[PDB]
Ligand code: B12
Ligand code: B12
């Protein structure tokens with residue numbers, strides 16, 4: 123006990139950096155599910171987020187599958203197209219937003235507040251994904267971490283779109 | 296400052312593995328409290344979850360109390376009966392559920408979404424509980440970690456029971 | 469990739485203890501935003517929490533700014549006045565509360581449940597803040613960690629104020 127398996131049945135510590143990486147993707151997936159279930163976004167944002175939840179499972183499958191020279195069967199890996207899709211969504215959803223000069227106090231709607239929670243969890247997942255690469259520079263792909271990086275940018279953008287209180291700004295004083 | 300006490304007044308780093316373990320049990324307890332307060336489960340599931348919250352405090356008391364040869368007064372420890380009770384709940388609640396072939400996108404009801412959040416926090420708590428044992432193989436009991444392990448199985452089962460959207464499945468594509 | 473910048477443009481690992489500290493302040497800020505957006509506290513508690521969200525950004529700016537002998541421009545730092553303000557709020561809000569003899573099961577209202585979630589995240593942020601100091605005893609200030617320490621005391625107090633189920637107590641049995 124205290125051990126479990128990767129996608130290739132390889133035994134691993136429940137403390138393992140790869141497992142912590144795709145476990146945090148799970149936590150991020152749940153956080154996005156909470157934003158959907160309690161924030162009730164419009165149908166278009168709902169479809170975007172549901173697609174991200176699908177992507178996050180693709181990222182966890184990538185992280186749970188060691189990189190090998192020639193595998194038994196082709197592995198599921200994140201690709202740059204995943205990230206370019208997030209970039210496209212960022213541009214579209216950020217186009218109507220006014221310019222931001224300072225930090226925003228997270229909150230507002232249930233949807234915007236929960237998108238902020240998901241943002242911070244996703245960024246925690248990203249930190250874990252980079253720690254997985256640091257531990258296995260040759261065995262772990264960096265695209266999962268790069269996908270999580272841009273996802274937090276998108277979640278921040280969507281949190282602003284969804285906020286009816288507008289941008290409540292941080293006054294350093 | 297930066298130090299605190301275990302159950303025996305022993306001084307400990309606020310970074311300590313045992314403290315991180317029972318602190319994550321606290322976070323898991325709060326997550327379950329959110330599922331209750333926002334998901335409004337039926338009275339039967341409410342009683343199950345409230346009992347788990349009670350168990351989690353028993354687990355934290357176990358984790359905060361070093362194992363010693365003969366203690367001043369008898370310690371509160373998790374027992375196999377705690378875990379067998381969770382196993383019994385898993386079987387009962389999983390009996391009516393259809394067979395699952397793939398991963399589920401967390402979400403659906405407020406209750407099912409928040410049970411997914413609690414699931415991922417509990418699994419984070421489990422990882423912390425195993426790290427506590429690794430650091431003190433002789434001083435920390437493994438039953439807290441084993442209880443958290445099966446609790447995440449139950450929370451997954453309950454999340455399916457509570458979901459009115461059924462199982463929204465991950466399409467790897 | 470896998471690197472980012474502190475407030476002084478210094479390059480840093482996305483695993484860095486200082487970054488993990490002010491990232492957890494962000495997560496705590498979001499958690500408080502969720503309590504506001506879903507718990508709908510009265511106007512007075514709303515103003516207290518919004519002020520704390522402002523303080524947390526001040527703490528993150530402190531943590532992201534290395535301590536130096538004579539800086540280019542004066543840094544934003546947490547002060548004892550921040551903490552004394554939290555102490556004042558604790559006393560006021562705890563005055564009407566009955567004496568507590570045991571642990572409370574987190575939950576109750578949406579507000580009180582989410583204040584418990586925020587409490588546990590803030591305590592996680594505190595642990596991270598102390599780890600930042602341990603890593604840079606001379607470069608990181610301890611007042612951010614001390615502010616987070618007392619904030620968790622206040623959030624516990626407010627969670628009791630907000631709970632309509634009163635104190636649901638842990639029975640170790
Ligand atoms: C990595 C991993 C995860 C990671 C990341 C997964 C991801 N993002 O892709 C995380 C931590 C998120 C995870 C979570 C869970 N997992 Co998991 N996981 C694994 C693992 C190791 C690899 C999965 C994978 O990525 N395969 C790669 C993809 C491409 O394979 P695939 O073509 O989709 O085929 C998979 C599915 O059909 C899946 N599957 C088949 N039947 C079932 C039934 C259920 C309920 C689930 C969830 C999956 C499942 O298993 C196949 C092989 O992986 C497998 C064991 C293994 N060695 O394969 C366990 C495994 C799939 N996990 C399992 C379980 C139980 C779960 C959890 C319910 C644990 C929990 N209580 O929280 C959750 C469910 C989360 C959710 N939303 O559905 C079980 C499912 C079997 C069962 N009926 O008990 C497995 C088989 C391990 C085990 N034997 O206990 N897991
Ligand atoms: C481990 C520990 C926890 C851990 C795990 C606890 C668990 N799962 O059992 C965690 C991190 C979850 C925790 C949380 C908190 N704790 Co604590 N904790 C401790 C500790 C170290 C041991 C508790 C224990 O498990 N005892 C074993 C069981 C079997 O003992 P028991 O028979 O139940 O007797 C206990 C209770 O009566 C309890 N108690 C007595 N009066 C009060 C009043 C309050 C408000 C609470 C919460 C408890 C409490 O203290 C007795 C001795 O432990 C004690 C200090 C110590 N050395 O005992 C502090 C202690 C109980 N904690 C304390 C506090 C303040 C809290 C928090 C409010 C901190 C916060 N701001 O979040 C939260 C409350 C969480 C909740 N839902 O109620 C205080 C309570 C005293 C007070 N009035 O200020 C103590 C005494 C430490 C201190 N002096 O500051 N804690």
Ligand code: B12
Nearest residue numbers: 222223224225226274275278474475490494525528529532
């Ligand atoms: C530390 C830090 C944070 C930390 C802690 C911040 C804190 N608690 O104070 C955390 C992790 C919380 C954080 C979060 C984010 N940050 Co930040 N962060 C930094 C950083 C390194 C220092 C900020 C600071 O504390 N300055 C000290 C205070 C006193 O300075 P100030 O007088 O307030 O001046 C600042 C503001 O005007 C701010 N600013 C100016 N324009 C904009 C626009 C936006 C959208 C934001 C959020 C801030 C911002 O930048 C100035 C210089 O820091 C800067 C880069 C740098 N080297 O300065 C990036 C920076 C401010 N962050 C940035 C971003 C993108 C974000 C996030 C949106 C990331 C995300 N996707 O989650 C979130 C927003 C969180 C929120 N609620 O608003 C950007 C903003 C620029 C832009 N338009 O893209 C910067 C400039 C880095 C970058 N170039 O990518 N960050």
Ligand SMILES: C[C@H]1O[C@@H](n2cnc3c(N)ncnc32)[C@H](O)[C@@H]1O
Nearest residue numbers: 245246248249472473474482487491
């Ligand atoms: C926006 C600012 O937040 C910090 N930063 C960058 N990436 C992350 C992450 N994944 N998690 C937390 N903080 C991060 C850096 O300091 C950056 O400059």
Ligand SMILES: C[C@H]1O[C@@H](n2cnc3c(N)ncnc32)[C@H](O)[C@@H]1O
Nearest residue numbers: 126127128136141145418419421422
């Ligand atoms: C279900 C899959 O999730 C991983 N796994 C097992 N236990 C945990 C845990 N506590 N936290 C996160 N991931 C876990 C293993 O890879 C297992 O096979």
Ligand SMILES: C[C@H]1O[C@@H](n2cnc3c(N)ncnc32)[C@H](O)[C@@H]1O
Nearest residue numbers: 299300301309314318591592594595
């Ligand atoms: C109240 C009890 O909780 C533990 N404790 C103290 N500070 C923290 C923290 N920031 N996070 C988690 N647990 C903590 C100590 O054991 C203390 O005695």
Ligand SMILES: [Mg+2]
Nearest residue numbers: 271272274275
């Ligand atoms: Mg980034």
Ligand SMILES: [Mg+2]
Nearest residue numbers: 444445447448
């Ligand atoms: Mg398990």
Ligand SMILES: [Mg+2]
Nearest residue numbers: 617618620621
């Ligand atoms: Mg404290």
